[PDB]
Amino acid sequence: SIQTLNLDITKVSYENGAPMVTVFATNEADMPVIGLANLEIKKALQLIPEGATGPGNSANWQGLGSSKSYVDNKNGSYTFKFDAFDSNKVFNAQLTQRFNVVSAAGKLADGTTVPVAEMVEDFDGQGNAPQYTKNIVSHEVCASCHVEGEKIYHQATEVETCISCHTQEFADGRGKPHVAFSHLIHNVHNANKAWGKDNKIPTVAQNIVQDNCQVCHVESDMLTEAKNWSRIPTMEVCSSCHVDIDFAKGKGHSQQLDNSNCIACHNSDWTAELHTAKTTATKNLINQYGIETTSTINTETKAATISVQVVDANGTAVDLKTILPKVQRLEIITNVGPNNATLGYSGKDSIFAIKNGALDPKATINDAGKLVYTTTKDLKLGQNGADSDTAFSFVGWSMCSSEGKFVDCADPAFDGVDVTKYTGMKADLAFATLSGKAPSTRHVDSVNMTACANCHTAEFEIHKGKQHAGFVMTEQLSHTQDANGKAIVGLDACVTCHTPDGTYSFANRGALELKLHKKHVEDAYGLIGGNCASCHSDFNLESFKKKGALNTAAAADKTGLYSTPITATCTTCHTVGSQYMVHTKETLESFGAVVDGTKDDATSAAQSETCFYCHTPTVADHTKVK
Numbered sequence: 001s002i003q004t005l006n007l008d009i010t011k012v013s014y015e016n017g018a019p020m021v022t023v024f025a026t027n028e029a030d031m032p033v034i035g036l037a038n039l040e041i042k043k044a045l046q047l048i049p050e051g052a053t054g055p056g057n058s059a060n061w062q063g064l065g066s067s068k069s070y071v072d073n074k075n076g077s078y079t080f081k082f083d084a085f086d087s088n089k090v091f092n093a094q095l096t097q098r099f100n101v102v103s104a105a106g107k108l109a110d111g112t113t114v115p116v117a118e119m120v121e122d123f124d125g126q127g128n129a130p131q132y133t134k135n136i137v138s139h140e141v142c143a144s145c146h147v148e149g150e151k152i153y154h155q156a157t158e159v160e161t162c163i164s165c166h167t168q169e170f171a172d173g174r175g176k177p178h179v180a181f182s183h184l185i186h187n188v189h190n191a192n193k194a195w196g197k198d199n200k201i202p203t204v205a206q207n208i209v210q211d212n213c214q215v216c217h218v219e220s221d222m223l224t225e226a227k228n229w230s231r232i233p234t235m236e237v238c239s240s241c242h243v244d245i246d247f248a249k250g251k252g253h254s255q256q257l258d259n260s261n262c263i264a265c266h267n268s269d270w271t272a273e274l275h276t277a278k279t280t281a282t283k284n285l286i287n288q289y290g291i292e293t294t295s296t297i298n299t300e301t302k303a304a305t306i307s308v309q310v311v312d313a314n315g316t317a318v319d320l321k322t323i324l325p326k327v328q329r330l331e332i333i334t335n336v337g338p339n340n341a342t343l344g345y346s347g348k349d350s351i352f353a354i355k356n357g358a359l360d361p362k363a364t365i366n367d368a369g370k371l372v373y374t375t376t377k378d379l380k381l382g383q384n385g386a387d388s389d390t391a392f393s394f395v396g397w398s399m400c401s402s403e404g405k406f407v408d409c410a411d412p413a414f415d416g417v418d419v420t421k422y423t424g425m426k427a428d429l430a431f432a433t434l435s436g437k438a439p440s441t442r443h444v445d446s447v448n449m450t451a452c453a454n455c456h457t458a459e460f461e462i463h464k465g466k467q468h469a470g471f472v473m474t475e476q477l478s479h480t481q482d483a484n485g486k487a488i489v490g491l492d493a494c495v496t497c498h499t500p501d502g503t504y505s506f507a508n509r510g511a512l513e514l515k516l517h518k519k520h521v522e523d524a525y526g527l528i529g530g531n532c533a534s535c536h537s538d539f540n541l542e543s544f545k546k547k548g549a550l551n552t553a554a555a556a557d558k559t560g561l562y563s564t565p566i567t568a569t570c571t572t573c574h575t576v577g578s579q580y581m582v583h584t585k586e587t588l589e590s591f592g593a594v595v596d597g598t599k600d601d602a603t604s605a606a607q608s609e610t611c612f613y614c615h616t617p618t619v620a621d622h623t624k625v626k
């Protein structure tokens, strides 16, 4: 019923000693929300300033108590009092005062459902605006990778609530320095030491975050202490990733008995630069060059010729001859039928037109300086309906590089395993038709690269390694825009290999409709769960009318098994015969489906599924049925 619950602390009065605190609650239409049953001041704190506990030390949140005692004022406002304010007798009205307010998900009396809400707000010791703050991060950065509105590990859903409990005082009282939040937060994302009684090694978090301070520390005018990540070096925080130093004993580092001299040597400029240098260098290399790719079908031979024009950062032509010694790999993959690829993985056309500065004999550079390659696989243009009039070609490439500079590929046999030796570059996509009519294109309106980029960064070099140059996905291959006119960077190019027939094996669920689900429900469920919005803005259910069969398993003799396309898409996470699929195989067939059968039968029945008579999935709730 209520989509968003807004909370504001509108008044703080110390006129009776302990503060009286009024909160005003509104819904998404700014109407007052009356009848909240689980509103609480989870923490009352005050801010001990930087340096007060010792030279170089951080500011800290000193505890003053909590309260679940409040009156519903019947107008949207709620007024708290404290039965046991400041039981340690440390209150100091010269300090900034903070209240952390939480409302649990639940229902009002009438049964209106109400979602969780959390906030903090800061004041001076009289309830006016505060004079100074410790505002370093905000809760939004966490939502790039952890589902917003759900608990992150435990207790709460917004980082300021974590910070309000995991204080220096909290850590000291337990004798556990590592549970102060500014230690813990880096700890649980960095693999240099384990955490918890389970000794969990954060291998996955390490792979995603990659010690990239900028995914949490973002410059902002609303966060006046945002530069603290480079301006306040302390042994307590820096040791969370640098786990091998013993500052007291002078092991791995000169002895330091306190934090008084850290900043004298570790100046902010150096700490900021050194921890971001590698991502900055790589991103600078990626934005040096681009490519513009065209393709045309020869109407008589039915082969596509692909032309690649390197350009510089301004879009100005660059003869590929001038940089060929630095091109580590360039690959061209061509399939047919963008909405339902027809060549499969084995029948696709693919070539490394360049490898470590060498042109393949099947590719040339023409006098205009463009690279030119003509397909050799039978493209079967026009042999499977109107969609098969269109070939689509994915171009990925990489350039040799060292310490932020492009370099000559000096070793012809370099196998691409050592990714410190080269940079994946901006990939491209080109369309061509046999008929010469306008090409079909795949829908890109339900999932795009901005969502992938929230967790993997916009500079994600997909598949970089021994097998591929690394595909960086940008507006180079955009061919439509959203309702606000912003170019959509789609994943339709990935279908060149992620075909309805799978990838190199029939057992991988390699079709793009299945592959991203399989990978992330298996390896990212702690971050995503059933949160379809982590990738989707909506579902394009109409696209199923353009789909054929989808490969879902391999037979015992290694050949391919196929399902009808809706059933194939749902069963990646809802395996037939498992505890995750109430429908038996027999019931699914009764709904028109083919389940792990032959390509012919699955193709024949592909528009026979009745699933959407009952199922009406939306990204907000994909489980919805009539």
Ligand code: HEC
Residues within 6 Å of the ligand: 144, 145, 146, 203, 204, 207, 208, 447, 448, 449, 451, 452, 453, 454, 455, 456, 462, 463, 516, 519, 520, 523, 524, 527, 528, 534, 535
């Ligand atoms: C948008 C549709 C995408 C795409 C194209 C990819 N991702 Fe993710 N991903 C996430 C996590 C936690 C993992 C596991 C990492 C690990 O186990 O170490 C992955 C894995 C991948 C891969 C595998 C290759 C790799 O270098 O890891 C690939 C190719 C991939 N993903 C592509 C996390 C997320 C998300 C977290 C909420 C988001 C959203 C996405 N990924 C989105 C995408």
Ligand code: HEC
Residues within 6 Å of the ligand: 137, 141, 142, 143, 144, 145, 146, 152, 153, 159, 162, 185, 188, 189, 204, 205, 206, 208, 209, 215, 216, 454, 455, 526, 527
């Ligand atoms: C993407 C760049 C992320 C950002 C931004 C944040 N987190 Fe994260 N976190 C991320 C991953 C890939 C993992 C590993 C998940 C797994 O299943 O192993 C984590 C882990 C955590 C944890 C540990 C709990 C756990 O699930 O293992 C915590 C407590 C955590 N993350 C908190 C957290 C906070 C508070 C963030 C905002 C300051 C935040 N994360 C951002 C990925 C990313």
Ligand code: HEC
Residues within 6 Å of the ligand: 151, 152, 153, 154, 155, 156, 157, 158, 159, 161, 162, 163, 164, 165, 166, 174, 176, 178, 179, 184, 188, 195, 196, 197
């Ligand atoms: C008090 C009201 C808390 C809130 C808010 C948050 N956490 Fe917490 N956390 C709390 C306690 C009492 C403990 C156990 C401390 C101990 O003595 O072991 C924890 C522990 C964690 C841990 C484990 C850390 C480790 O073992 O090294 C993590 C990763 C953690 N908490 C994460 C976390 C997050 C992300 C929070 C905000 C969403 C959060 N906690 C809030 C108490 C409280």
Ligand code: HEC
Residues within 6 Å of the ligand: 058, 059, 134, 135, 136, 137, 159, 163, 181, 182, 185, 186, 189, 209, 211, 212, 213, 214, 215, 216, 217, 228, 229, 230, 232, 233, 234, 237, 238, 275
């Ligand atoms: C999200 C997963 C983060 C990443 C990645 C990095 N930091 Fe961080 N940092 C994060 C949080 C939630 C906090 C606590 C903020 C608070 O209000 O308490 C911090 C804190 C720090 C600090 C302490 C600043 C202080 O005033 O004492 C430092 C010095 C710091 N972080 C440094 C730092 C560096 C150098 C990082 C990249 C290598 C980095 N952080 C990443 C969240 C996250």
Ligand code: HEC
Residues within 6 Å of the ligand: 186, 190, 210, 211, 212, 229, 230, 232, 233, 234, 237, 238, 239, 240, 241, 242, 266, 271, 274, 275, 277, 278
């Ligand atoms: C994990 C999120 C980290 C935190 C917190 C801090 N550092 Fe760091 N540090 C980290 C990495 C991944 C690296 C290597 C980066 C690279 O590209 O080489 C570093 C490196 C340093 C260095 C240089 C290495 C050396 O041998 O001295 C220094 C001087 C350094 N880091 C200092 C430093 C300080 C002062 C921190 C607290 C403010 C700090 N690091 C936190 C990862 C992480």
Ligand code: HEC
Residues within 6 Å of the ligand: 233, 234, 235, 236, 238, 239, 242, 245, 247, 252, 253, 254, 256, 258, 259, 260, 261, 262, 263, 264, 265, 266
């Ligand atoms: C000058 C006398 C320094 C003082 C004071 C502090 N640090 Fe230091 N530190 C200094 C140097 C010259 C280096 C190595 C530089 C390099 O690039 O190799 C370091 C290293 C560190 C590191 C990184 C350790 C590693 O990656 O192996 C960290 C995390 C670090 N220093 C932290 C730190 C702290 C917390 C300090 C105050 C207690 C501190 N340093 C003071 C020079 C000097």
Ligand code: HEC
Residues within 6 Å of the ligand: 333, 394, 462, 463, 468, 471, 473, 491, 493, 494, 495, 496, 497, 498, 503, 504, 508, 509, 510, 515, 516, 519
């Ligand atoms: C042929 C040149 C490919 C292109 C183009 C793309 N992918 Fe790929 N991918 C390919 C193979 C041979 C495999 C392994 C077999 C399998 O099907 O799993 C993969 C695997 C993936 C995975 C799973 C995790 C992994 O093994 O890395 C994902 C998530 C994936 N592929 C995604 C993906 C995307 C988003 C692409 C377009 C940018 C893309 N692939 C293109 C082969 C090829």
Ligand code: HEC
Residues within 6 Å of the ligand: 442, 443, 446, 447, 491, 492, 512, 513, 514, 516, 517, 520, 528, 529, 530, 531, 532, 533, 534, 535, 536, 538, 539, 540, 541, 543, 569, 617, 622
């Ligand atoms: C990123 C890791 C994803 C998550 C999380 C979810 N989906 Fe997805 N989905 C993803 C991709 C790359 C694709 C392929 C798009 C293409 O061009 O083929 C899909 C596809 C679907 C479809 C097909 C219709 C469409 O919009 O393309 C459906 C019905 C679908 N996905 C459902 C779905 C549901 C219900 C999810 C939450 C449990 C979900 N997806 C999550 C990537 C990702």
Ligand code: HEC
Residues within 6 Å of the ligand: 517, 518, 521, 529, 530, 566, 569, 570, 571, 572, 573, 574, 582, 615, 617, 622, 623, 624
């Ligand atoms: C992985 C990306 C999934 C895809 C693809 C589909 N679903 Fe799903 N579904 C998924 C999860 C993680 C869950 C949660 C299970 C739990 O108990 O937490 C669900 C749940 C459902 C449900 C409700 C559960 C039930 O027993 O009925 C329904 C009705 C459902 N899912 C339907 C459904 C359909 C029709 C799909 C294809 C369009 C589909 N799901 C895909 C994860 C994923």
Ligand code: HEC
Residues within 6 Å of the ligand: 566, 567, 570, 571, 574, 579, 580, 581, 582, 583, 588, 591, 592, 593, 609, 610, 611, 612, 613, 614, 615, 623, 625
């Ligand atoms: C009405 C007669 C239905 C038809 C036609 C289809 N499904 Fe269904 N499905 C239906 C119900 C009442 C439920 C349970 C809803 C709940 O919340 O419990 C489901 C469930 C699913 C699920 C989730 C299963 C699970 O998590 O255990 C999936 C993935 C699913 N259904 C897929 C699906 C397919 C592929 C269909 C066409 C072949 C199909 N459903 C048709 C009701 C009905």
Ligand SMILES: [Ca+2]
Residues within 6 Å of the ligand: 008, 009, 010, 011, 121
């Ligand atoms: Ca206010």
Ligand SMILES: [Ca+2]
Residues within 6 Å of the ligand: 117, 118, 119, 158
């Ligand atoms: Ca909030």
Ligand SMILES: [Ca+2]
Residues within 6 Å of the ligand: 186, 187, 188, 189, 190, 191, 192, 193, 194, 195, 202, 240
């Ligand atoms: Ca760690």
Ligand SMILES: [Ca+2]
Residues within 6 Å of the ligand: 291, 292, 293, 428, 429, 476, 477, 478
């Ligand atoms: Ca282009």
Ligand SMILES: [Ca+2]
Residues within 6 Å of the ligand: 607, 608, 609
């Ligand atoms: Ca039909």
